[model samples]
Target: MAGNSIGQLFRVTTCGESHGVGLMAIVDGVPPGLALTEEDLQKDLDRRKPEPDQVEIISGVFEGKTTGTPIGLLIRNTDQKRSSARETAMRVAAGAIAKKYLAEKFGVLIRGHVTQIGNEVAEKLDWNEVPNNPFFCGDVDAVPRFEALVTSLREQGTSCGAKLEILAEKVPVGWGEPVFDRLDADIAHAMMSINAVKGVEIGDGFAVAGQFGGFLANHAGGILGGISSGQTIRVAIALKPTAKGRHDPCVGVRATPIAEAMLAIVLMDHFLRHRAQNA
Candidate 1:
């Protein structure tokens, strides 16, 4: 319940429930005179808005320019259907905003794997599809096939799962610890913390585990002495099939199952660490 914050210098603390009035985040420690505006933040919020065809987006607000103080942002919840679990629904909505903000502000592109979106659905997806896709996929070429699968599943009233990958570029060197508290551990925690994430792999990750040292020379999946090696830090998350499926029982401790909505929080802890190293 206490794990809703990220970052060290430019920290963000997110709060609120999915079915509640709205979701919000308090961004702290932004540099003074950073030329911030509601529009700057709104652009990302708009992309995170749920599919207009399926869900409605309420207003999003950002208090004037940040006063070198915490900036508060909020989005009203418009889609209140009872199709999936409340927690999953909330995570999906909240995560979209987080991803957009991070991507635009940090120049880090986050991508999802196959299981991130639990479906085989396809349609004419825009190559620059906004972040509101139920699948969160940005590939235009994959739309047709994805749509076909989704259509078939809808007919059968079934669900599927896909893996998700979140990649970050320009990661600084020496952002990891020597032995214990490895950067990989932190990355794993970030990916695993997502609502539906069941598995996490860094860089070549599990695949490299099968290879010997000679074969694993290049740490393809962001592994270097258990730390980030100044490469594009890559992490893949595997989401299980939606717990809320057609004809699935909805009762008990696990009752009220929700779709496997993928939500991730990536903290730039290393930036502060890097600064401290120089200091």
Candidate 2:
């Protein structure tokens, strides 16, 4: 068992093992009759596993619709012995549902980019250019450099660190607690829960401590006093280099969706919580 589940409203808890009877998920709080099926879950799993991970809905659904209850899902471990980081597949699948709910109901969207690798940091962030390259970096010109760096690192049998940025758009103001349970704090907590993450930042992040000029910029990162300020929520994370030569050369390339999924889960939970408390 990993440690705990994520989210309060749209709670997602996973169990089973990489080489056990298979991986399973229990997702709660998806509103009744939102139109879900095994197909919807398989699409995300396919991206994580090439073995055609088939998902089965054992509960919380009937007639191709949800019943406003806890949904139980399972993915039999056919590709176990080779499973590393496969646990995240269920997380990504669960996140797909959260993202769908956010987009369908609130029009909110979440996206991410790899901003840096080793000594190379992106010069510009263009959403259109991210998927075209292998690094998931938004800067087109910097892609070749990233490739070269990774190539050299692989040859040397070493590793390097990376930086990632995530953005959430169209999130309405006030989706977080005013005090300790602030949105940014929860985002940081969620981001840190990922593997290899060593540090997290909001908006201008650490740069804010160095300046005290005016509010002319978004140094606060769309958050003020722990609450969303209706601006695009910007976040960045630093992933430490993997320790061994046997590990993936660079995790940043594949971590794009993992980061995006976590952000979506946090926002979805906050949205439901806000509606429950204030709406």
Candidate 3:
């Protein structure tokens, strides 16, 4: 059997390939009474490619509300490309629902942005400017430089690596378990699931080698003892560059939404688990 799905209670299994007729996703374990609609799912899917990634809710929803059952979603791959990353649109579609569920039920919010492309680093954090740029970078000033770098590399018949940063705010305490299923571990694993991701970091990962002291900063990345400390969860991931076709050069440009979705799914799964055993 192929492992096509992730998560325990809030599991999602996507069925389809790059050039398949279409992509299908089944989201299980959503609590009833949450509002959901195809349009709601389409927003994030569109962020991936302005896709007519139209989402159709085929089952598990009644009267525009979740019925506490598995929700089935279908997106016809209208313009199927050879790129395998396109399959992630289904993941983003699934994650959009998870984001809605989490935001409505627990008030947790998730966000992601490009921090580094090749050697062009974004030194600012303007959430508003993220969607305005091609790289999904927060700083508007970095756009030109990033553009030049990616353009130069693409013309040179090569590519460079990238780094992405994700932040989840208002995550409640005690969402993760001990001894095995740590919160940080789950976050890292979910992040590592992204394509071309070579490394995952929490807070100042790999940067604490020369720093040490009591009360040192958020070195733990808002996670303590494998549990959420009721602080904002900070995460970072490194993406190894893969040269793409002529039309597609920088793969990391569109990864921001995908990263956000994965974080949302993991948090939502943990919340559901915590509610089941501890609530």
Candidate 4:
């Protein structure tokens, strides 16, 4: 065991492997910046080796950043590092920096919520209700029936989907495309690429397919005329419920993790595309 790898703003205790004993690192200290796994840490071994009985910092804080190398700090213990602290520590440190960078550099903040599970969409989040139950339950009146949904899913051998939304604030204004290439066009394409995803929407997406006019809010969804309109950008994706048999129901539960990942991929693709056109 090595000494604690705590940092000023973010940190995590790590272990190279503990699942053998059925254990893993707890990422309580990591921030919203970056995550670096052990394999990520191995790329620059020569510069990251730890001294005996000490923690070796890799891609250590430089340029006021923890990125470009912020994987777990390789700690040198007599038996070598064996706790789940190193891997977790670097991610926490990096996440802190990313949140800082996104805020100060891009003026964008990201947040997500499980808004709909099955057909029930939350009308509003009762701040009190968020932590009241185990479900992503928000609306005070809505969650009381979650157990029924779960019960029905298992018994009926049906899969359920959760609607997840991620929003970015203070997005740069007027960011896009034409000639079969618009920002909206590309975004829609990206969202649709996820497996089991059946629908994608932007700026009041599918709503426009139904009916609309100038009198009511256009719900720009942060885009207009094939470009970003300096409004909050929103993406809503519908994941098809998985599971075709009784042995496995509620595929949405297993698929939930991929939602965040897919969103990240979609946004990042657009982010880089924007950089190419404007940065």
Candidate 5:
């Protein structure tokens, strides 16, 4: 609650912004059930950013397992740097190629549309009608409804909200491994990796918690046994409404393509990895 420290049952959050090496731990409550090397930490960090955020994990692991020791983390803030905000990664040839190839070759269609914009839902769901609105809704009948909302927002904005759903069609069953490699796990991770994504839902998502039948229905979101069931993989990504920052892209609408691109890359990664193994 004080300057970046957040948790209840957790690893201690340490800081030293003035200390120049202030980066540290953000994870805890992980039970040891498999091999974990410190490099595992660096590997993800290495893959995430090209520029130096300057994070270093100093301890609490040994021989691919936790030593139950104190973990030290340091974030180096000595060098200040910034990059002009690049447009979302969706607008690239490689992303296009990846999505296209996946769809054409595998029937792996990845489609997305805005589902909610500040306390609104599409009046209906119609894939064919998705292109009718700039807000990405498919309710042709709701044109005025959508337009009114967008108009109001173009003029004023706030839980302020935006929601997008990306569904992966024709995902073969068993593409994911148990536990860590579960398909939904990967999808959640991929979507989480999307910048500014504040929430993700698989199928009915959190709604299932209070549902009458629960897992007996489609609410499982297509991944039931840590494996795909060959059903359409459904995912919904929810991001907090935007407020202008010192960065570019004054509007969240600019993030739509980027979000779609992320969904594509995720499915593409699965497609590429799919041919390599199976349960």
Candidate 6:
């Protein structure tokens, strides 16, 4: 239940369930003699909140700027619905709230898209334009197309398909091991573990794999001998058609169906591992 945690020297541990009362994190191993306060953490928390304008954004993810000491943080769960078990599962699996907080706090951008749901075609959009639309894509030109697709899905009484991209400035080097324990392996494991996610890729990930050396040779997907090349770390995760479609029974295994939650925990683990090795 308490799987969320990150960092070594600056350790963070998160607690709470999807439908639980609230979520909280405890940070430890901070350096001493640094300024700290609740406002700092609040800034990040606010952005993670669904109604960003309603709540005060917590600046830092911890109390203050960090006293180089352990800090505790919490966020009350505000959203709820009278939906079925599958719908409830999807919302929790998305972990939108958690992702928002992490992005603001770490200055990283995590974006998602709905692609390949039955006959739906993937739209090419700019990442910058995502803020204007609810779907979070940067393609102003594709608004009508996206809206049409949504309408189509609604008409069918079912929805499906999604792709997510997590982009960050070059992650520091020495964050991964060589030979067998490659960072790519870790990333793949982290992403594929997410709920509804069926596939995972890195920048130019699968594209370059089929190309031979020569003019089409570019190994810039951050995979070299199972180690990071100190370049931008771009990860793309693909979610299968929604398991809880309104028009149909949920697909795939009916076990716990908590892949989304597991994915979050795995990604956070890798993030901390990367930070410990590089930062």
Task: Provide TM-scores for the models.
Answer: 0.65, 0.91, 0.92, 0.56, 0.61, 0.62
**155-192 per-residue lDDT for model 5 (tens digits):** 65432566777777777666666666666776776567
Best by TM-score: 3
Q: What is candidate 2's CA lDDT for residue 239?
A: 90
**Per-prediction tally of clashes:** 23, 0, 0, 14, 4, 24
Please give the range of 10 consecutive residues that has the lowest summed lDDT in model 2.
44-53
**How big is the RMSD of model 5?**
11.6
Report lDDT (Cα) of residue 240, candidate 5: 73
lDDT value, residue 19 of candidate 2? 73
* Candidate 3 colliding pairs: none
Pairs of residues clashing in candidate 2? none
Q: How do these models rank on lDDT, best leading?
A: 3, 2, 5, 4, 1, 6
Candidate 1 on 1-279: residue-level lDDT in tens? 688775555455667676677666665554344444444444433333233212223232334333455556556666745533333333344344444444555655544323224434333434355243434555555645555666676667665656655556645556665565467776666556545556777776688768884643446665578655656766666655553444421111121011111222333444445556785
Model 5, 141: alpha-carbon shift in Å?
A: 2.6
> Residue-wise lDDT of candidate 3 within 56-152, one digit each (tens)?
8998899999999999988777774555656687788888888988788678888888889987999999999988877888989998999999888
lDDT of 4 by residue, 56-92 (tens): 4444345433443333454443443233333333333
* All models, RMSD in angstroms: 7.1, 2.5, 2.3, 11.3, 11.6, 6.9
Model 4: runs farther than 4 Å from truth? 1-101, 126-137, 214-218, 244-249, 253-261, 264-279
Summarize candidate 6's per-residue lDDT along 1-279 as a digit string, tens digits. 445653333344656664676555565554343444444334433322113212222333344343444444455556554222322232232233334334544543344433333444446757566556555544566656666766676776665565555554434445555454466776576555455767777777777668685522334554556655656566666666663444522221121123333333334444555666654
Off by more than 4 A, model 1: 7-10, 48-66, 76-141, 178-181, 214-218, 244-267
lDDT of 6 at 174: 52
RMSD of 3: 2.3
Against the correct fold, how does model 1 do in TM-score? 0.65
Total clashing pairs in model 4: 14
Flag the better candidate by TM-score, 2 or 3. Answer: 3
